[PDB]
Write a protein that binds this ligand. Structure first.
Ligand SMILES: CCOP(=O)(COc1ccc(C[C@H](NC(=O)O[C@H]2CO[C@H]3OCC[C@H]32)[C@H](O)CN(C[C@@H](C)CC)S(=O)(=O)c2ccc([C@H](C)O)cc2)cc1)OCC
Lengths: 99, 99
């Protein structure tokens, strides 16, 4: 689809069998979701934002369906203010900016 | 044009008579620019993201040219790590997400 930006580009995602709402975020290199339970191994990681760094749990090769488009990639889980879908997955679903 | 997301979507902007590099950021409601001494009145503001909040100065009705497309709106000036072009300006240049 074509998504305008007059409102936040929020979409429904399916991850670990659960539906959530997430923001399509071209300013984010990586994908960061709010605290949740995901199966499998994970490694601690640090990521920095506008206000500083947070500790996240890094889950690799995680299946995630974004607005009906499948992706399999890295998902960071931690105290982000909102679920954000970053470029690592936006590229997988073929998302581009156009003007 | 069309901008893929393999790399950060960095473009040249023109503001206050200066050229700068900025990030087209669909995850940002508003626009946040590096420290610059713009003329005119302003009001203090707090903006938050990953890692907490930072103090910024809010200037209104600022003209920015983004890839030759002009836009006029609010700009937040402060110690941001990157120049962030938010939806308030992206909408004015007709920017959309597409997949
Ligand atoms: C060399 C130093 O750089 P640095 O590492 C940080 O650099 C960066 C800092 C910020 C960004 C943009 C930010 N992306 C981001 O957080 O991405 C994280 C996850 O993926 C990684 O990729 C890049 C960083 C990591 C997002 O797109 C937009 N945000 C809102 C989003 C969280 C939804 C609520 S916002 O910025 O907070 C914001 C809030 C309010 C407004 C106005 C008021 O409406 C405007 C902007 C990109 C690079 O320093 C470490 C301290």
């Amino acid at each position: 689809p074509q998504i305008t930006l007059w409102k936040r580009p929020l979409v429904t995602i399916k991850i670990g069998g659960q539906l959530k709402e997430a923001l399509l975020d071209t300013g984010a290199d990586d994908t960061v979701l709010e605290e949740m339970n995901l199966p499998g191994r994970w490694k601690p990681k640090m990521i920095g934002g506008i206000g500083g760094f947070i500790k996240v749990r890094q889950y690799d090769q995680i299946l995630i369906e974004i607005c009906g488009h499948k992706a399999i990639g890295t998902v960071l889980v931690g105290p982000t203010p909102v679920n954000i879908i970053g470029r690592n997955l936006l590229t997988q679903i073929g998302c581009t900016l156009n003007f």
